[PDB]
Ligand binder design. Sequence first.
Ligand code: A1CBZ
Lengths: 141, 139, 129
Amino acid sequence: TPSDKPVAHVVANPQAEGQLQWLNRRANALLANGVELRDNQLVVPSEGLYLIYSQVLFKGQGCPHVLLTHTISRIAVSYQTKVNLLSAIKSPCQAKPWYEPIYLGGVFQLEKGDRLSAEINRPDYLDFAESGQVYFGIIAL
Amino acid sequence: PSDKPVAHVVANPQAEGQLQWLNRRANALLANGVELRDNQLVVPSEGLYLIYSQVLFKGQGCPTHVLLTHTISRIAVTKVNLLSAIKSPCQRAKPWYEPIYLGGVFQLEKGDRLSAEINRPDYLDFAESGQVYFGIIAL
Amino acid sequence: KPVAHVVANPQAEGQLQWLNRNGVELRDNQLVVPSEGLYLIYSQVLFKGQGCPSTHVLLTHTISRIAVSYQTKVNLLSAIKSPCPWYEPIYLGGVFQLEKGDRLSAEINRPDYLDFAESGQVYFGIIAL
Ligand SMILES: CC(C)(O)c1ncc(-c2ccc3nc4n(c3n2)[C@@H]2CN(C4)C(=O)c3cccc(OC(F)F)c32)cn1
């Protein structure tokens, strides 16, 4: 049986300077059943409950103060500003290399035309030495 | 359309001296039988559930052996500790930030009450939305 | 709609071995996909230690896919943590389209640091959507 559930799982472009850019045209990544990726945002095709998730991986070669943030935001139709749905702050430095993963997840009622963004404050600290470390997705329940 | 019991409640940024959960806010929900009664999530049916919660603490400098705790408890129709974490933000102004994330899968029974509590609500950070939450997902 | 929730065997210490109790099979420490379709794959592992050593400790947790039509191993989700008593949990989860016969594995690099006391914190599963 073929599912018609709006789903997305986009991955970060490891070659995008000073930014966390989401791609669907990669192995084990997808945009299906109405979900679109427009201006680095996931656009919701229909109203309903959705599971929203994102993971980023930060890495630094040592400690030089550094604040790392990762946020999933929602912009509703006819609105312009992002309202935080999920957000986390980490302080990796309280020269050995440090690693800081941030995982955000939750269930949210979304409306048709909503735009979701998964953003960070310090893309200079993003790590891409391996696949599956930086991602963002939604699944209609 | 799924009939899986789900919940995602957020802290009241105005409720001083407490970590009070709200479902009647934008981007917060109680669906498929889950209820929020007496600051607790009430389980509608038996089964495996993913339980999660994040709280963010922030202080304006370390003058002091401050202990920060975050716990998720279960009360059955028997009180058990499900998830717990302790953090010591003070090694020794210079602001500090301390997030505590708790997550896990637990077998819950119908009528179970889940609570997500902290010991220092005076250190809770509310300068931004989406930082303090409590949720459950039936599997 | 098949589901699978498997937990770490606390008696097979020194290796992250999975224990089962829907129709998703557990063969050779891997979850085997029964049919073509979409799936949420999640997991959690818990690490702990009594202190820090000279050699820099790196903790990793990865969920891989061995596609049946090509037989190679590709990361689906991965995370690294540098804990330097300490406790370090690692979470993963995402929706992937998978084919019949695909094998999923959830592995770590330091089983000597695994925490077997927490069953509700060392697990691996899938749910067909
Ligand atoms: C509704 C639906 C699709 O059927 C479903 N959603 C989620 C799960 C599930 C069960 C156990 C899990 N343990 C973990 N997860 C699980 N997901 C991940 C990662 N990590 C560990 C978390 O602590 C976590 C926190 C918040 C959401 C989150 O899910 C993420 F996909 F959005 C996670 C099962 N079923």
